Amino acid sequence: LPRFGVEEWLNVHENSAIYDIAGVSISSLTLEELFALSGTNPEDFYKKLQGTKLNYGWIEGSPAFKKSVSQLYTGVKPEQILQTNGATGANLLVLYSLIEPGDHVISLYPTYQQLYDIPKSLGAEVDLWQIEEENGWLPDLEKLRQLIRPTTKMICINNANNPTGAVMDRTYLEELVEIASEVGAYILSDEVYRSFSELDVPSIIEVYDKGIAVNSLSKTYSLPGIRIGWVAANHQVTDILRDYRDYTMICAGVFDDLVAQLALAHYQEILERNRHILEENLAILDQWIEEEPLVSYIRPAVVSTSFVKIAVDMPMEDFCLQLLQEHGVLLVPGNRFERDGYVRLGFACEQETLIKGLEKLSQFLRRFD
Amino acid sequence: MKLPRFGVEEWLNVHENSAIYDIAGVSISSLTLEELFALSGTNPEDFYKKLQGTKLNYGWIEGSPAFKKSVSQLYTGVKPEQILQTNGATGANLLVLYSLIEPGDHVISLYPTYQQLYDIPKSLGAEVDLWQIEEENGWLPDLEKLRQLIRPTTKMICINNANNPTGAVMDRTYLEELVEIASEVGAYILSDEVYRSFSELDVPSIIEVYDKGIAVNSLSKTYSLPGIRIGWVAANHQVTDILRDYRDYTMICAGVFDDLVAQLALAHYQEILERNRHILEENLAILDQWIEEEPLVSYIRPAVVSTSFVKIAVDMPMEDFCLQLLQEHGVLLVPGNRFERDGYVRLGFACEQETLIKGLEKLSQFLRRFDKEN
Numbered sequence: 001l002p003r004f005g006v007e008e009w010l011n012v013h014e015n016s017a018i019y020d021i022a023g024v025s026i027s028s029l030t031l032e033e034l035f036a037l038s039g040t041n042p043e044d045f046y047k048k049l050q051g052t053k054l055n056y057g058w059i060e061g062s063p064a065f066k067k068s069v070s071q072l073y074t075g076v077k078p079e080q081i082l083q084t085n086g087a088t089g090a091n092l093l094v095l096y097s098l099i100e101p102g103d104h105v106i107s108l109y110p111t112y113q114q115l116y117d118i119p120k121s122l123g124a125e126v127d128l129w130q131i132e133e134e135n136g137w138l139p140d141l142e143k144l145r146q147l148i149r150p151t152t153k154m155i156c157i158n159n160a161n162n163p164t165g166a167v168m169d170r171t172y173l174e175e176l177v178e179i180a181s182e183v184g185a186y187i188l189s190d191e192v193y194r195s196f197s198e199l200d201v202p203s204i205i206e207v208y209d210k211g212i213a214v215n216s217l218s219k220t221y222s223l224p225g226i227r228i229g230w231v232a233a234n235h236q237v238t239d240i241l242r243d244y245r246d247y248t249m250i251c252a253g254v255f256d257d258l259v260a261q262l263a264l265a266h267y268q269e270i271l272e273r274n275r276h277i278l279e280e281n282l283a284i285l286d287q288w289i290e291e292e293p294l295v296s297y298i299r300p301a302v303v304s305t306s307f308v309k310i311a312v313d314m315p316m317e318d319f320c321l322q323l324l325q326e327h328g329v330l331l332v333p334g335n336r337f338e339r340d341g342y343v344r345l346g347f348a349c350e351q352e353t354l355i356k357g358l359e360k361l362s363q364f365l366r367r368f369d
Numbered sequence: 370m371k372l373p374r375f376g377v378e379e380w381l382n383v384h385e386n387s388a389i390y391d392i393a394g395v396s397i398s399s400l401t402l403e404e405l406f407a408l409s410g411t412n413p414e415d416f417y418k419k420l421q422g423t424k425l426n427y428g429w430i431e432g433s434p435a436f437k438k439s440v441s442q443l444y445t446g447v448k449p450e451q452i453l454q455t456n457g458a459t460g461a462n463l464l465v466l467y468s469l470i471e472p473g474d475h476v477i478s479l480y481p482t483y484q485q486l487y488d489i490p491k492s493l494g495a496e497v498d499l500w501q502i503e504e505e506n507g508w509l510p511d512l513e514k515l516r517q518l519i520r521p522t523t524k525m526i527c528i529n530n531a532n533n534p535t536g537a538v539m540d541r542t543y544l545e546e547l548v549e550i551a552s553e554v555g556a557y558i559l560s561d562e563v564y565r566s567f568s569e570l571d572v573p574s575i576i577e578v579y580d581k582g583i584a585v586n587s588l589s590k591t592y593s594l595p596g597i598r599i600g601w602v603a604a605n606h607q608v609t610d611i612l613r614d615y616r617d618y619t620m621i622c623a624g625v626f627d628d629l630v631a632q633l634a635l636a637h638y639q640e641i642l643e644r645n646r647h648i649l650e651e652n653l654a655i656l657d658q659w660i661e662e663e664p665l666v667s668y669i670r671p672a673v674v675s676t677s678f679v680k681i682a683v684d685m686p687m688e689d690f691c692l693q694l695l696q697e698h699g700v701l702l703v704p705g706n707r708f709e710r711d712g713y714v715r716l717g718f719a720c721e722q723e724t725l726i727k728g729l730e731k732l733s734q735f736l737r738r739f740d741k742e743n
């Protein structure tokens with residue numbers, strides 16, 4: 001199986017970044033920040049924590065975790081939720097559980113790398129369903145019809161998508177579901193990037209009984225450090241997944257689940273904090289893209305990742321290295337998603353970091369005129 | 370090569386909640402944060418002030434500098450840069466197997482052993498040979514049979530030392546002969562070392578006896594902290610560089626709090642080992658006395674490891690024996706059929722002393738149903 005592309009870039013280059021606009025998370029919370037924004041008393045949390053056995057705990061996730069996650073959806077019960085070690089752990093559990101040698105898997109591309117390389121390592125025939133810049137970074141549904149076979153086991157998507165930040169609304173998702181439903185294919189939808197836009201973007205599990213929703217508190221809820229995610233699916237899928245957790249994780253952490261319960265009990269407070277960070281930072285990014293003649297993009301659907309086109313006749317791998325070498329501005333070069341000529345720009349970092357980063361990138365782009 | 374359901378896991382998923390006395394190996398006298406603070410002499414407030422100002426971002430992707438250093442110090446000749454933090458030994462086993470096994474690779478696995486060790490390679494397209502263990506050889510497999518199984522192209526040999534379920538260990542002498550055999554054809558040796566022996570035997574880590582030894586371990590079993598999901602892989606520079614490029618497939622990283630607790634535990638590992646040695650020795654003393662007093666039970670005594678595999682001299686399938694025991698008295702064991710060795714049961718005794726004593730009393734009562742009438 002090949003080296004994880006974005007990881008291999010961040011391993012070699014993250015420690016050399018002064019202005020990091022590469023990461024695609026929304027400025028993380030400290031535990032004290034979580035207490036302040038939730039209106040919680042620290043002492044009450046520490047009292048419960050310190051007397052809690054750090055044993056294997058709730059393997060499935062706490063009852064409160066499951067009920068809170070279920071309430072984020074329409075028509076999903078607590079029993080349909082399995083806690084995982086992040087969305088990373090959820091994607092792995094789903095694929096390792098369900099993908100078998102000879103199965104046909106269609107994966108959105110470029111997308112989160114797990115979604116096509118894990119199936120390929122398990123012996124599945126993987127076809128890449130290509131996103132198109134000319135159609136607002138959405139893939140082509142007629143190409144999906146051509147790719148699908150009467151035996152297709154699974155279609156993997158990322159909604160909103162990494163790196164583009166484009167989303168499939170209800171209309172688009174329904175046409176995808178119809179195509180999938182013809183051959184009885186599951187649809188795995190990694191939904192860690194929640195759209196804050198006006199668009200009607202339901203979860204795959206709310207429109208399809210064979211939809212498998214993956215999500216986490218990492219990107220949308222600013223808590224990657226607890227490694228808490230989930231899988232939401234039907235009873236048949238959930239019952240298979242329960243018997244494979246010891247291959248990948250056994251379970252998530254006891255403290256981690258405690259923090260997830262508190263965050264989920266105050267999820268609206270966190271969403272409000274993050275909606276404002278995203279809206280403000282995206283307004284700053286929109287104005288900057290317009291002032292710069294060498295850069296353009298398809299604006300993301302109010303999601304914390306963007307894919308910006310740089311009008312410079314150079315390999316972005318080289319452009320980004322020199323940008324980091326000279327000014328300390330870290331981006332992910334487009335070649336890491338097999339779409340060279342672009343750069344992934346995560347703009348949901350601390351506002352000043354984005355401002356200074358763009359200002360330094362603006363000084364860098366001046367030599368190309 | 371379809372990945373099957375994890376056997377022990379199925380059994381625990383269905384039956385754990387019906388147990389009152391869990392002697393199946395899940396209960397390991399796990400520490401609370403309060404007990405960790407007490408035994409390490411830490412002021413709780415200082416730890417919470419550190420914790421609460423720490424960003425819950427991705428943090429130390431490979432484990433903190435303190436973690437890598439402290440883990441490396443548990444070994445001879447291992448540098449901090451040879452350590453990668455993982456989401457338990459579970460995550461470490463998967464990371465190593467996923468990173469290194471290619472379709473068509475020949476893999477030899479200890480068997481029965483922890484299921485990841487042989488089933489993950491099969492799912493990745495490896496041809497897997499099972500290196501069988503027998504009670505008659507103290508649950509150690511035959512090194513002469515390994516000389517017959519080994520091929521010039523063998524990629525890796527997988528072991529669990531001490532082994533789950535038996536608690537038997539390969540000491541330095543045994544490991545040196547294994548390493549000689551592996552060296553001949555250049556095969557790696559993955560050694561899952563979550564069960565540390567407290568015996569007088571010299572039990573080095575595989576990485577201490579072989580440059581291509583890959584050691585997997587965690588704070589879950591030996592250090593009483595499964596709830597933080599912190600383990601690691603220790604390996605040579607070349608292997609560590611490979612493993613580093615695959616971590617986003619499986620975990621990205623372990624938690625920030627989890628690493629903070631790991632740092633504190635590892636900085637006081639001697640105190641945790643001292644606590645745990647007393648629990649294990651006291652509980653093994655209780656088990657040994659019970660084994661001798663019970664005429665229907667016998668075993669190959671584990672190497673002062675918290676897992677045992679006990680032979681029950683009853684003409685009944687162990688799954689049915691264990692199901693009836695569980696319903697009647699709430700005593701949970703893992704029936705031997707789940708390790709392809711019927712007639713035995715996995716009995717874990719790192720649980721609280723009173724639980725073990727009550728589990729064994731009820732097991733003794735239950736065993737009276739199988740005595741011959743006069």
